């Protein structure tokens, strides 16, 4: 039995839900309290009776505040995760710096007085939009212990991610002119190792700003990815393999079926 399964058996409805099965509360981390990042908001399930939860850090992109990705906080946390949406030290920080700040935000959770006993410190993930998604890839390349990475319309000058050993969902926007998929998202997917559990999801007709207000497709598959890999929850593979049928997805590539390591 998988000790990390949380919540009821999922359906497409449950992963599309704006609020998941877990009631959530929040706490604020000021810049003074934040070593190595610009502060943030932590969303967490109040129900402790099922055990601890994996942790997720989410970064905004260049010139953007926490507000540009804040909606992901409660939407993911209510599926059974402790999620910190960060501000960066400055809004002009570059992608690798954002990766270091994502890692610093995860490390903060380990001793945060409100959530330190709610996280499993060894099951953590990174996400981000635009340069923050470049940061998510950078954090994974710099920390092979991370359990999942999700760049959303990621932007980075580094195109080669062959050293990443963290299951990665790359979400591109078809009509993105800021981080065009042909030179950013798709190139990232192509250079991730072939033996990695990975997927590329292109959002039909979408512009760069698709991640800055609620997008059900982004939320539902981020949730399924975090469940499948942060929690090793095989109940969620059904949504990722075979390729999803959503109209909002114009292209899907993956290494389905994903690896299931076992001692049977
Ligand atoms: C990978 O993580 C390490 C550890 O945080 C980073 O190395 C630090 O980088 C900062 C500024 O970049 C330096 O001030 C520290 O002295 C470095 N620490 C060590 C132990 O070397 C490294 O930059 C990260 N890599 C990337 C690409 O962001």
Author numbering: 2 to 265
What does the paper say about this structure?
Plastic pollution has become a global environmental challenge, driving interest in enzymatic polyethylene terephthalate (PET) recycling by using polyester hydrolases. Metagenome-derived polyester hydrolases, such as LCC and PHL7, have garnered significant attention due to their high activity at elevated temperatures of up to 70 °C. Their engineering led to the development of optimized variants, including LCCICCG, LCC-A2, Turbo-PETase, and PHL7mut3. , PHL7mut3 has been designed to improve the activity and thermostability of PHL7 by the Q175E, L210T, and D233 K mutations. In this study, the PHL7 wild-type enzyme and the improved PHL7 triple mutant PHL7mut3 were expressed in E. coli and P. pastoris, and their PET-degrading activity under various conditions as well as their thermal stability was assessed. Both the PHL7 and the PHL7mut3 sequences contain three putative N-glycosylation sites (N143, N144, and N161). To assess the impact of mutations and glycosylation on structural folding, we used X-ray crystallography to determine the structures of PHL7mut3, expressed in both E. coli (E_PHL7mut3) and P. pastoris (P_PHL7mut3), as well as a non-glycosylated variant with three additional mutations (P_PHL7mut3_ng), also expressed in P. pastoris.
For P_PHL7mut3, the glycosylation of N143 was observed. Two N-acetyl-glucosamine residues could be modeled, but not the additional residues of the glycan chain, likely due to disorder. N143 adopted two distinct conformations, with glycan attachment observed only in conformation A. The occupancy was refined to 0.72 for the first N-acetyl glucosamine unit and 0.56 for the second. The electron density for residues N161 and N144 showed no evidence of glycosylation. N144 is more buried than N143 and it forms hydrogen bridges to Q104 and S146 with its Nδ2 and Oδ1 atoms, respectively. The buried position of N144 might prevent its glycosylation. N161 is involved in crystal contact with residue H264, the penultimate histidine residue of the His-tag of this construct. It is thus conceivable that a fraction of the protein in the crystallization mixture was glycosylated at N161, but only the N161-unglycosylated fraction was enriched in the crystal because glycosylated N161 is not compatible with this crystal form. The N143 glycosylation site is approximately 17 Å away from the substrate binding site, but it is part of the loop that links an α-helix and a β-strand forming part of the active site structure. Thus, glycosylation at N143 might influence the dynamics of the active site.
